[PDB]
Design a protein around this nucleic acid. Structure first.
Ligand SMILES: [Mg+2]
Ligand SMILES: [Mg+2]
Ligand SMILES: [Mg+2]
Ligand SMILES: [Mg+2]
Ligand SMILES: [Mg+2]
Ligand SMILES: [Mg+2]
Ligand SMILES: [Mg+2]
Ligand SMILES: [Mg+2]
Ligand SMILES: [Mg+2]
Ligand SMILES: [Mg+2]
Ligand SMILES: [Mg+2]
Ligand SMILES: [Mg+2]
Ligand SMILES: [Mg+2]
Ligand SMILES: [Mg+2]
Ligand SMILES: [Mg+2]
Ligand SMILES: [Mg+2]
Ligand SMILES: [Mg+2]
Ligand SMILES: [Mg+2]
Ligand SMILES: [Mg+2]
Ligand SMILES: [Mg+2]
Ligand SMILES: [Mg+2]
Ligand SMILES: [Mg+2]
Lengths: 115, 91, 97, 161, 136, 96, 62
RNA sequence: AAACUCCAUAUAUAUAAUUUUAAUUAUAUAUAAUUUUAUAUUAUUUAAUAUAAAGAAAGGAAUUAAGACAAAUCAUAAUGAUCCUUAUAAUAUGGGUAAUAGACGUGCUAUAAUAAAAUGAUAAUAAAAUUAUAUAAAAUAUAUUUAAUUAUAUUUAAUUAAUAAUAUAAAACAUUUUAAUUUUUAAUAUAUUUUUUUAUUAUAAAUAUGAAUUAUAAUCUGAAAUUCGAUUAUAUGAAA
RNA sequence: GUUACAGACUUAAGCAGUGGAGCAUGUUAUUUAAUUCGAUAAUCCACGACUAACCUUACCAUAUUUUGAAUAUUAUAAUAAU
């Protein structure tokens, strides 16, 4: 609607905001909210023992779930910038941005790899 | 010979002669190279802490500039903060 | 057993060499215990150890052992893979065109 | 205070006259290295020693010595090395050869002549070739002779003389 | 029962509790002991006669410890049953232990005892000034 | 495997009963791996940071006495003013 | 001293292309072990509590 | 620039109740060398060669100045000017980034016997690194009459780690086989080459190389595998 | 397109390759509704990109949002903490 981009009013993340970041964050929140439910639906679907009609219904429900319920849709962005390439998980930062931070001394224990 | 051995055993001092060490007044602790002085076993938590610290730095920077009834704007300059994360307390 | 551990005769010959520069192969019982690396390197490390062990039995032969080239610790260390290069020295192909 | 014992001293004295034993026969080692390809020295060694064994079996006399003799015979003492010669006629010069270079030339020829023999296993082929050379028959000899003749032409092309 | 605690942090491994017992130290008869070992399966090591198990299923550490205790008690009850269920003719499965041993390395070998030479060892060298000094 | 199969199966079933773990002799797809998977949602949600963090807005709420200055905001406002002055301001937004 | 870790990470130095030039980074998790051997639990608790009270900057504990 | 630096090395000290053990180790702190000394032989007190005696003493990494190339980046990010503001801003569903005449780099796999394939459980021999957004052991089941191998499924033992797992390293080395090759086979005899020999009979340019291309069946991840993913099986077997 | 030294992976030896084959990947060109954008002599071409199914994506088709992600100004009203 007009007052918000997505259906649910989620907060903005602190520090660097970006449109893509906003999109990702919301998606992550919705996944967190509807994680157990999705799992339960998946279980009901992939069951040889249960009634077939019920499993079909569960599968249909899973199919009909939105873009923001999907775990696979989540992509690890850089947190300092808003890039989504070469994003290292141990400091949620992009390649160049990580290097910049590392050389400054922002990182907790990172330093030049001399051998 | 015994006396010499005893000396050798106890031979320590501040480095910088020509049995010696760099004292805490003679060099920087490598912890004072980094700005978030922390170790946590859960690395997610450590990352979250260092993010927080970075966000607080910005907030501090923002605070540092004052105004006096739109007459004088005294811009207090501040260094980059250094966050000391002991088990008990942050400093 | 020695023939069971080191299959390559070269390694065995190398091991023997400290005892062979002296006339003391047959005189000294040797109980080697290796760890890490591969077979040829292990054999070389054993040889090196044996020379040092022999040096204690008769210090006058130490110079002779050193001359033979057994008392020298062979430093040859595997070079690391550098970033842009494929291996240590092997660079990827250049293209002037 | 060092305190060397009498027996130890006697042993040291006995050692003193004896020279330090060589760790490798150098020419053989060189040959094995040349045979070898992919850091697979052991295989090259097995090939070479098997060939030498075969040679010995065919003609019962020291195989290594026979091989060395063959190398000495075959190795051309000099080579007519080509030069640019200050942008002019490419004036060739006889150049003396290092021992390795001499024996390297010989080995390549030996290998080539072995490769014309029948068997699947190269080691066998090599051994047969070595026996033939010991007995005294190869195109390698002819090639050496030709090289020597070509060196003989260009007598005073040598610079220092 | 070994408990773990991460001091400044809130690790999710703080809930992990690990029970560990030598099976011979448990108050069991020989038949029952064998049955207990069989029931344990991968949890019982045979080289060191040790049975251990850890639980991370529950939220808190104390809960997990209690659960482990309850399991142990159940295992003991099963071992002491013997009514129409002996397990006398199921040999001890030691495959997991041999796999673990293979994964690790071994230094079982030792210096031959008949190779030793006490006669060649360095004898005590006579130090006269030291002897003089020692008047106590 | 000289030891019989049925006995081994019985032993395995007993072990499963003792501990909580299930006993599936047939080897059918039960769906156990779907539920048993630890749910990772909270950690995923906590990626970008703690949304409740202090901002410049609050630095007026907490400390009204101190007349703070947000420099970047002030700069932006000055730029906007300059744009307005030289006829490069934003066009008025359509409503409809 | 338990063995130090080494978390390595390589990165292209430039913000854009020049991928032939790359820089390394490393992080060493230094580990030391203390072991208490004979104590009535209360004393041990007190010790631990005292340790965490006067803890130092860079050091984590388990 | 060199040097201090890091890695690696040698030695010493400290610590580790030698079950978190690998003490043959790990890690803090030192010391050590850009090595030293002497005899000679050439060229002018020194400097290169050789010889000798003393030593563990031999590398790699980081660091790439000033200027220049209006070299690269406004697609890491930020900012100047400028342009868009129901659109050049924002969200969803699908498609595209994977299109194919020729061409150009980088690689991978090949074109077989100084080289390929089977096998090798008192499991020949490593290092470095990862495992709370997990690592998944043993074992059962199916592919598969034994079983092993390989691949899935079943189900999670152990450990969030010098303790458990990823993971019995692989070449090596050893036996066996190998078309092109009537340079072999199998029927007879043969015999002091018997996993073999001899005699006489019959055995008549891409393979028992390579793995592109395609057909069908299964499996994996995921909510979803058509465009457009990854395995396994049974066939297919270009080019070279 | 100069004099003479000195320089090194420059050349010369040497070892293994590329270039022929098929495949992979990047680029070009052309195509396409879109084949997103940049890199394109040495100093581009498994480069930006340490993984393009959806996402990522920026491109295209069809739908639908219009103070929207912020900060401040001015008003009505509702809920919660004290
Ligand atoms: Mg320097
Ligand atoms: Mg030990
Ligand atoms: Mg410069
Ligand atoms: Mg330009
Ligand atoms: Mg450009
Ligand atoms: Mg700009
Ligand atoms: Mg648009
Ligand atoms: Mg879309
Ligand atoms: Mg592409
Ligand atoms: Mg490249
Ligand atoms: Mg082949
Ligand atoms: Mg298994
Ligand atoms: Mg382990
Ligand atoms: Mg093996
Ligand atoms: Mg053909
Ligand atoms: Mg084939
Ligand atoms: Mg060349
Ligand atoms: Mg071509
Ligand atoms: Mg080609
Ligand atoms: Mg652009
Ligand atoms: Mg392009
Ligand atoms: Mg756009």
């Amino acid at each position: 609607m007009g007052n918000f981009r997505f259906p649910i009013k989620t907060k903005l993340p602190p520090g660097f905001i970006n449109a893509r970041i906003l999109r990702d964050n919301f998606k992550r929140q919705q996944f967190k909210e509807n994680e157990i439910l999705v799992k339960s639906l998946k279980f009901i679907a992939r069951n040889m023992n249960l009634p077939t009609k019920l499993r079909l219904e569960a599968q249909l429900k899973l199919n009909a779930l939105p873009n923001y319920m999907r775990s696979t849709q989540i992509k690890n962005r850089c947190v300092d910038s808003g890039h989504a390439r070469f994003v290292l998980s141990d400091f949620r930062l992009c390649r160049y941005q990580f290097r910049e931070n590392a050389l400054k001394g922002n990182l907790p224990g990172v330093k030049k790899g001399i051998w | 010979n015994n006396m010499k051995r005893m000396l050798n055993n106890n031979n320590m001092n501040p480095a910088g002669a020509n049995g010696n060490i760099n004292n805490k007044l003679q060099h920087l602790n490598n912890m004072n190279n980094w700005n978030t002085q922390i170790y946590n076993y859960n690395k997610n938590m450590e990352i979250m802490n260092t993010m927080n610290d970075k966000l607080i730095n910005k907030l501090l920077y923002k605070m540092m500039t004052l105004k006096l009834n739109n007459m004088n704007i005294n811009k207090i300059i501040m260094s980059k903060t250094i966050n000391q994360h002991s088990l008990n307390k942050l400093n | 057993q020695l023939n069971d551990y080191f299959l390559k005769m070269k390694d065995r010959e190398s091991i023997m060499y400290p005892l062979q520069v002296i006339e003391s192969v047959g005189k000294y019982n040797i109980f080697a215990t290796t760890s890490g690396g591969g077979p040829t390197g292990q054999a070389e490390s054993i040889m090196h150890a044996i020379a040092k062990a022999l040096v204690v039995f008769n210090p006058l032969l130490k110079s002779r052992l050193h001359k033979a080239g057994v008392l020298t610790r062979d430093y040859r260390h595997v070079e690391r893979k550098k970033p842009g290069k494929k291996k240590a020295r092997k660079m990827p192909t250049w293209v002037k065109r | 205070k060092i305190k060397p014992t009498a027996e130890q001293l006697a042993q040291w004295e006995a050692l003193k006259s004896v020279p330090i034993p060589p760790r490798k026969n150098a020419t053989l080692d060189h040959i094995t290295n040349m045979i070898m390809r992919h850091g697979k020295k052991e295989k090259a060694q097995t090939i070479l020693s098997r060939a030498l064994y075969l040679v010995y079996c065919q003609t019962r006399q020291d195989p290594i010595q026979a091989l060395e003799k063959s190398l000495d015979e075959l190795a051309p003492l000099m080579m007519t090395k080509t030069f640019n010669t200050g942008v002019a006629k490419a004036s060739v010069i006889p150049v003396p050869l290092n021992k390795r270079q001499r024996n390297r030339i010989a080995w390549n020829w030996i290998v080539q002549s072995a490769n014309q023999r029948v068997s699947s296993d190269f080691a066998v082929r090599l051994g047969e070739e070595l026996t033939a050379i010991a007995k005294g028959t190869s195109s390698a000899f002819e090639k050496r002779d030709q090289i020597h003749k070509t060196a003989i032409a260009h007598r005073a092309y040598i610079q220092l003389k | 029962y070994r408990y773990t605690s991460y001091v400044g942090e809130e690790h999710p491994n703080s809930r992990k509790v690990v029970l560990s017992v030598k099976t011979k130290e448990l108050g069991l008869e020989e038949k029952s002991l064998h049955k207990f070992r069989i029931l344990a399966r991968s949890r019982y090591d045979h080289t060191t006669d040790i049975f251990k198990m850890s639980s991370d299923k529950f939220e808190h550490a104390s809960q997990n410890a209690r659960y482990l205790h309850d399991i142990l008690q159940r295992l003991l009850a099963e071992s002491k049953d013997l009514t129409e269920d002996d397990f006398s003719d199921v040999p001890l499965d030691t495959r997991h232990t041999i796999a673990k041993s293979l994964r690790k390395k071994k230094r079982d070998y030792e210096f031959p005892e008949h190779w030793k030479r006490p006669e060649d060892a360095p004898k005590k060298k006579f130090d006269i000034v030291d002897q003089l000094l020692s008047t106590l | 495997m000289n030891v019989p199969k049925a006995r081994l199966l019985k032993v395995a079933e007993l072990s499963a009963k003792i501990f909580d773990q299930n006993f599936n002799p047939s080897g059918i797809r039960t769906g156990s791996k779907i539920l048993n998977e630890r749910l990772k949602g909270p950690s995923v949600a906590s990626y970008y940071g703690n949304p409740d963090i202090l901002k410049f807005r609050h630095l007026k709420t907490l400390y009204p006495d101190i007349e703070f200055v947000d420099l970047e905001e002030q700069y932006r406002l000055s730029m906007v003013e300059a744009k307005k002055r030289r006829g490069k301001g934003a066009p008025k937004k359509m409503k409809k | 001293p338990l063995p130090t870790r080494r978390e390595r990470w390589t990165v292209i130095k430039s913000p854009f292309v020049h991928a032939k030039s790359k820089e390394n980074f490393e992080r060493h998790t230094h580990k030391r072990l203390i072991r208490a051997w004979d104590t009535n639990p209360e004393v041990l608790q007190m010790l631990i509590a005292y340790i965490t009270k006067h803890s130092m900057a860079g050091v984590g504990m388990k």
